[PDB]
Amino acid sequence: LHHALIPHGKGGRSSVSGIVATVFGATGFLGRYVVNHLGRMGSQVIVPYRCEPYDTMHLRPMGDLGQIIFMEWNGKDKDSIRKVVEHSNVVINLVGREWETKNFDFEDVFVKIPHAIAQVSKEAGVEKLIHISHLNADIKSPSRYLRSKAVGEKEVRAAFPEATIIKPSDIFGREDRFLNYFASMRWFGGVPLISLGKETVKQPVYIVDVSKGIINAIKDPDAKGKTFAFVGPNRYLLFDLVQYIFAVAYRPFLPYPLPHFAYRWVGRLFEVSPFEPWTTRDKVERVHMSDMTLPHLPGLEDLGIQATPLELKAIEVLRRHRTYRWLTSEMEDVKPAKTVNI
């Protein structure tokens, strides 16, 4: 087990966990939580970054001296990948956009890059590979996002047969694009919902739950070549979920029905932003797609994790979206939403 990679200590900041993890996409939403959970217990974390180094400062205090290393990398360059995965025994892939840029489409970020990472990790001798997919990934999906996700997981399994594939469903957290996205809709006055959100079921999952599931999957020997689905404990109709979101933020809820073609046109209109789009046609599709039910897959409870209900962690995200007059309202004030549990 390579004595230098033998666990030591109490399990804290100055301890040794025996994990040397290269975390692709560590500068995003899930990446910071994953790096934080790796660094709490004394793991060596390699952070490949393409952005400006100023955008990686928040990751520095997450590890002891020498336990977090930053190197530049290029998604379209295999030498960068091999350079950042030579000395690792765990490789985690969290790379992904929610929109298509002029340099990287969905096939570039969900198919080509994951496949290259998996192939390089396999030829480099990496023992464990964690690949993130979507619960709604489907080759026959109306979303290019999910089709690319399905093709990407097929090719990752082809290139790294012992990889672990995780399929979370609409992760919510402080820096998410799920609760914040719905909360952001108040500016346009009314909330446009296709079919008033009455024909969509969502099963959102907590960010800490997903990060702890990834951490436990690294440490679990049976989770080597399995496929997991990370979902929350409750299923909600989209209308009720958005109504609860607006109720927690104490904002007036004015839902109106909008036709699919018109709201797709709105998404296309928003897609022309050279910066981060406020919404896209792909987001239009994914918001109004019901979350699949996959009872044949192991879940968070198979990794020792009890799923955190949204009603316990919604306030820490939506209190920022309140006005001054409702900032101090307590968590148990907002009458949790009705749940369609089978």
């Binding site: 390579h2 190197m71 690792s88």
Partner: protein
Amino acid sequence: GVRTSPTGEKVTHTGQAYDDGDYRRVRFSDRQKEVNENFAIDLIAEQPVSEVGSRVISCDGGGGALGHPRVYINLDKETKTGTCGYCGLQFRQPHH
């Protein structure tokens, strides 16, 4: 007297080089490994043995008070030279 390991890592004067399978090598990627090139053992090995005509010699490292504490070295054995325990200089009595 620097020397490289079969991996390409420079071996320091203390002889420590990471094993090819050691993950701690990653700290030198995109960076360098600090190694001092003036190996003191080779440098002191180049100094000639001083010939002196007494059984006991004194060494303070040169420079008076800028050297080391002054010690006295016995030179009775012709089999080996008298080495200073502080500086490493060598002394011997005339033979041959």
